Subunit: 295 residues, 3 copies
């Protein structure tokens, strides 16, 4: 796209504020930003806020979201679809033109770990170019295992293809498959989908802790066979809904856009890989690390 040549829009922070007991404002941008997806490989991603996946959003069950999208793309329209919400797609997930803003309002009344993404046709193109993310909706009454959890992180799986190549997006294998982590609390890492960051700078934990991961596989195209090496999931909540409670799973099947909350114990010091167990995808990048120490 001629109007994207040389464009690299600096990342913009997510803006969010609570405006009532059950109402929250969220302001995001659509922007074109160079991301290093593998060592030496730059992808001029289509993004929310200059991150791919986009920034984490966390709301409470029952919150209405008043969402604004500021489109900084010079030429392509963009939009937003939150899987958390009940909305009219053809009224509420509509396009925002270049250099314009749009505000849409909709309720999040289901707890869980939801995908969000651009909804502009062709949706495959917009998702594959980087316009995906996660929204977490925290359950009003928690999870039954909350009191057991010592530490928590967010992980997101996505794929990358040949740049802006619809034939490859539709017909080709992924070039890379990757994990990212998005911060829940100060000090947590906040990364983009690349093949290396979470190997070189592992997530951290302490021996004996029960870890919770909020996970989502945004695709665009693959399913995920999510596994943590050296442990078994004690508890799994499919899509993050507390009712969908499995126990003692080695591996969690996630559809494309599929989420879960998973909990596991790390019993011994060491480095614990986190993979999709579709090992072609692991080989193409989808291995993160969790470094477990005595402190």
């Amino acid at each position: 796209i001629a109007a994207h040549k040389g464009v690299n829009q600096a990342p913009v922070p997510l803006k969010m504020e609570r405006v009532g007991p059950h109402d929250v404002h969220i302001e995001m941008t659509a922007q074109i930003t160079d991301i290093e997806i593998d060592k030496g490989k730059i992808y001029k991603a289509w993004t929310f806020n200059g991150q791919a996946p986009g920034p984490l959003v966390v709301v409470n069950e029952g919150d209405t979201i008043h969402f604004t999208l500021k489109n900084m793309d010079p030429v392509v329209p963009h939009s937003m679809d939150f899987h958390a919400v009940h909305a009219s797609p053809s009224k509420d997930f509509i396009d925002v033109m270049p250099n314009k803003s749009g505000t849409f309002t909709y309720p999040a009344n289901k707890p869980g770990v939801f995908m969000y993404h651009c909804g502009t046709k062709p949706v495959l193109q917009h998702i594959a170019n980087g316009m995906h993310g996660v929204i977490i909706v925290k359950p009003k009454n928690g999870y039954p295992t909350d009191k057991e959890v010592d530490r928590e992180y967010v992980l997101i799986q996505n794929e990358w293809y040949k740049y802006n190549d619809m034939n490859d997006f539709q017909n080709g294998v992924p070039s890379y498959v990757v994990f990212s982590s998005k911060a829940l609390k100060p000090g947590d890492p906040n990364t983009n989908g690349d093949t290396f960051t979470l190997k070189e700078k592992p997530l951290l934990a302490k021996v004996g802790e029960k870890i919770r991961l909020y996970i989502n596989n945004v695709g665009p195209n693959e399913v995920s066979s999510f596994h943590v090496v050296g442990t078994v999931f004690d508890d799994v909540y499919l899509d993050g809904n507390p009712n969908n409670h499995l126990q003692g799973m080695q591996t969690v099947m996630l559809p494309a856009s599929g989420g879960a909350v998973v909990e596991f114990t790390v019993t011994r010091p060491g480095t614990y890989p986190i993979v999709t167990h579709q090992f072609n995808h692991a080989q193409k990048g989808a291995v993160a690390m969790l470094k477990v120490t005595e402190t």
Copy 2:
């Protein structure tokens, strides 16, 4: 196949009648019929009754099915495998030769949303050429959420490949991935697996309704990441068995041949896309529409 050149057998209605409190007769054909799978693209499908997927069958839990297949194919044998039934494959799912009929009898004692398909070797060929469908077995005691449902439809996912090309069937990506709808009540649409019909003539609903979809992914080869844009599934019953009850799922993973009953609320007027969230497949056809109006 030389004996299929120029052959286009007009669709024949499904014949079904109840013959006792727990016994039903079903009569289907195997036939060769031209279907427009994408605009301008004709596939000379191998079909049941001139539809691909085939006609919907609905029986009650505990019904014995007395099934007749009339093979109108001039040269290829065909057969029938209902996933609903307990049967001897090597006695009851056997071939019916060209211009012959065969009758087989077997019980449907499990509720759910089951695939049916031709079982003639090579099964991949027969399924990929169009010989798939769904049988619904209604549970004796219903679903716990029945009283909440306002409207219901059947949707089926399938893929199409290069015509009668076993190399492509085994080794290639799908050319198209598609939804169809099959009628449960008079006035419901009844369509074939194509890339366009359910976009141009959306399924219809009213604002505020709870919708039930009976769904099955017949493959042959892909899994499905089933999602309705702008809502969350309130309730999911895997394979349509009332015991396999999930809640608040954004997306339902369906294996090949996998079914479900899913229920969701449409809260606002508008058009709601229905997708597999493996967006390469969505781009290749697998997007249906649900138009929601005030009336």
Copy 3:
């Protein structure tokens, strides 16, 4: 690999002995062994004990495993990762050099049907070349349906690619997809992952029996849509954990490394195919047979 040319190490029996009420010794080899994966097609597999998948391991919930790997490979290091265990990957799943042995100790405190595999980088290579298997951990309190089961077998799904070809492992479709069976009791068959053995020498059962299968899809790369023709699963326990109990499933979705216990009734004499319902994979080998007779 020059040092594998002409190498064909005869299979070595698994060695296992109980050494306390809650402690077991297991001794396995890593070895290079020619396996006929399809008629006329030899793969010089990387194996545990000269089988691919490797030998079955069965322990009780709460057993600590004291595992020794004897590496008979002349040049490549190997390792062992049991998905059943809680362990430090970077201390306990480490490499054993050529012509050396290593012993690692770790507890199996979760019931189920777990993958095991070599964990040596690149893990894709080691798994794809044949270094996979299953460990079953029997639940302390059984499954609620135990008293109903008449007969049981183990089945494992794996794929085979072009020989030792990392490009194909990462980017290519499988050449073959296959089932194997591993013995639980004397007289049970014990086979390797090939396209033919379980078709020519079917698993055996009697009319009217309830059959339990312990199943795992080891991949490396594909998910599995597990189905038995002519029946419906009465009960399914995901990953073999008794809590993850589904009923009346036609088809069980297994992620890569995913397991289950499945139970079904064979009501009529005959031969019942067992498939992954991703029929491209079935066509490439993944069809086993269960021959059901009056005796």
